[PDB]
Design a protein around this ligand. Sequence first.
Ligand SMILES: *[C@@H]1O[C@H](CO)[C@@H](O[C@@H]2O[C@H](CO)[C@@H](O[C@@H]3O[C@H](CO)[C@@H](O)[C@H](O[C@H]4O[C@H](CO)[C@@H](O)[C@H](O)[C@@H]4O)[C@@H]3O)[C@H](O)[C@H]2NC(C)=O)[C@H](O)[C@H]1NC(C)=O
Length: 400
Amino acid sequence: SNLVCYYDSSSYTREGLGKLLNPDLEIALQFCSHLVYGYAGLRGENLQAYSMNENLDIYKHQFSEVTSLKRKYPHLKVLLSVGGDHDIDPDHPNKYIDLLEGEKVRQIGFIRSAYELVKTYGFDGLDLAYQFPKNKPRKVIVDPHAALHKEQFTALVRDVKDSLRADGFLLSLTVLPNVNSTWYFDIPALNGLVDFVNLATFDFLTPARNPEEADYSAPIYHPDGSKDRLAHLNADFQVEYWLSQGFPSNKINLGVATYGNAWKLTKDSGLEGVPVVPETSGPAPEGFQSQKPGLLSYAEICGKLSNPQNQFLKGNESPLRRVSDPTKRFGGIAYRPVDGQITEGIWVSYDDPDSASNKAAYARVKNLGGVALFDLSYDDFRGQCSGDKYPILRAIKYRL
Ligand SMILES: *[C@@H]1O[C@H](CO)[C@@H](O[C@@H]2O[C@H](CO)[C@@H](O[C@@H]3O[C@H](CO)[C@@H](O)[C@H](O[C@H]4O[C@H](CO)[C@@H](O)[C@H](O)[C@@H]4O)[C@@H]3O)[C@H](O)[C@H]2NC(C)=O)[C@H](O)[C@H]1NC(C)=O
């Protein structure tokens, strides 16, 4: 099976423990079948593909430092990913749709630019992690041209593929969290156009989208215990959906995240950790390593879990408690409620090595092509949690 490892290059320049330099990157490569370099973006002035950190990717040669890793790993495939929800442009918030709705000249510009990036820097292919509009978050019609958009995307994928054929370059698509395949993906038309598809079957709920309640963010199956949870929000529904639409199972990769979604709790959230957790208050304070409110890396989460040793810590240092439904269907929970001394409450939905392993087993059972891991920079590459580096990656590979 495949093990498609995403690499967010912004991780190269992170300060402290979050920094992922190339020697640490390379260690993942005895487990990854594919490396995907993230993320190129769209220029708001003409929507061509371009590096969102030219100084690093191009002027300090990081694109080709990473693709030249194939010299050391002759079976490794390296792709370049566009979008990935990392193309954040408040100045041009309609780029991805405008590219779909674009005139030939505009689309050709993108196709040519994206092609140039792949070829010039030694990549084996392109990942279209298209930033479509997502499911509207339920609080407490987003796109009325979805069907037009679906058609335009199919056509754009065909033309992109066409540009890559002569070189034999791969094309993958990534269906990003809460991107709805009914609205945008003409799945029977894609089998003949793309080498594989990555379903990002995680972040179904996040503190950014769902600041006022918390629930499992990447369960395999639907948890009946989560009241009123939308039934398409689980990995199995997404996978079966793609299979339903006639996509070959072995061209599908199951997305698994290495980071957790972390909500700030309130007194009114109560003391129990099984979701749905009410009266939450947006993202939890950022971690010191990952510096992203509402996100924590696996090492940051592992580092907070309660043990007999850290038992003595109190107040806002008291350790997090594990909640782990024994059916292995839903994924991990670690939390600390607002209570007395504890003023800073937090609820984290995440996969650890065991639960990621579970996802890998499911993928194997469903005869999928493999797993796509988002991303190496939040796996514990330094070995902080147990001493073993890349504990989530290795656990997944064990079971594919
Ligand atoms: C794109 O987004 C749309 C929503 O805008 C989404 O459609 C929704 O799909 C789900 C999943 O099929 C539908 O929910 C099911 O609906 C039926 C009928 O109401 C229920 O019988 C089902 O309940 C069965 O299963 C649930 C969990 O398995 C149980 O909790 C429940 O008790 C039942 O056993 C289930 O609720 C939903 O009705 C539509 N919604 C709308 C607004 O039309 C679509 O799936 C998304 N596409 C993808 C690929 O994600």
